[PDB]
Amino acid sequence: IAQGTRVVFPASEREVTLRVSNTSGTPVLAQAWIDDGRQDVPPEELQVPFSVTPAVTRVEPNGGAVLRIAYLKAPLPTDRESLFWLNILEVPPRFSFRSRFKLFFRPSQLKSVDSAAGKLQWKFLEVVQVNNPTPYYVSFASVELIVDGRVMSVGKGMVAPFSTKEFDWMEAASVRYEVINDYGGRNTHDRALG
């Protein structure tokens, strides 16, 4: 269901499409909606500047539907990505299953996402910290401390533009981390700890 692991929404566009596949042998209804990180309130009341058409869709057995995401020109930061969430709920019966994808609104002048993961700087607090001095979210599939080949896994996550993230778990450590690109692929980086 969806391929698709994230949506990049470039400021120059009025809309972007997305495929959702029904891999099973029965029709399912797919409901789609966007929120701004709050999942605990009726979506309409958040007035996020995105709509998803159609909001509810039948998806054929071994088939796929196309969802359409449209931006309503609204004041969002101009110097950094904004983060929204696409939800897809399968009401497939009938119980039902719910998916949640990152949506990155990306201002036009931001052309260097591919360089971002490599400008992160790292340091110990005990407990380690990454500083993201860039305009882009950086999503980690894995972060690891390494000492003479010994791997100590500290978790995955995401660091927001112009922010710091802390990872918790000595010594001559290096950090190795993998990040998810715009297309769901992964790239890796090693760095020393400050």
Author numbering: 31 to 124, 134 to 165, 174 to 216, 223 to 247
What does the original paper state about this entry?
Briefly, as implied from its name, the CU system transports its protein cargo, known as pilus subunits, across periplasm and outer membrane in a relay manner mediated by two functionally conserved proteins known as a periplasmic chaperone and an outer membrane usher. In this study, we report the crystal structure of P. aeruginosa CupB2. Similar to other CU chaperones, the CupB2 structure reveals a classical boomerang-like fold consisting of two immunoglobulin (Ig)-like domains. With the structural and biochemical data presented here, it is now clear that CupB2 is an FGS-type chaperone with two functionally different Ig domains.
The unit cell contains two CupB2 polypeptide chains per asymmetric unit, which were refined independently. Other disordered regions include residues 125–133, 166–173, 217–222 and 248 in chain A and residues 123–136, 165–172, 217–224 and 247–248 in chain B. The structures of the CupB2 chains in the asymmetric unit are very similar with a root mean square deviation (RMSD) in Cα position of 0.3 Å. Size exclusion chromatography of CupB2 is in agreement with a monomeric protein in solution. Hence, unlike the PapD and Caf1M chaperones, there is no self-capping relationship among CupB2 molecules. The N- and C-terminal domains are connected by a kinked linker, residues 145–152. The relative orientation of these two domains are stabilized mainly by polar interactions involving the side-chains of Glu111, Arg145, Tyr183 and the main-chains of Arg110, Pro146, Lue149, Lys150, Ser151, Pro182 and Tyr184. Interestingly, these residues are all located underneath two invariant positively charged residues, Arg36 and Lys141 lying in the cleft formed by the N- and C-terminal domains. Arg36 and Lys141 are well-conserved residues among PapD-like chaperones, where they are involved in the first point of contact with the unfolded subunits exiting the Sec translocon by capturing the emerging C-terminal carboxylate of the subunit's chain. As shown in Figure 3 where CupB2 is superimposed with the structure of the PapD:PapH complex, Arg36 and Lys141, together with the F1–G1 loop, are all in immediate contact with the pilus subunit. Only the biotinylated CupB1 peptide, but not the CupB6 peptide, can pull down the CupB2 chaperone. Consistent with the limited trypsin digestion described above, the CupB1 peptide showed no binding toward the CupB2(R36A) mutant, strongly implying that CupB2 is indeed the periplasmic chaperone for CupB1.
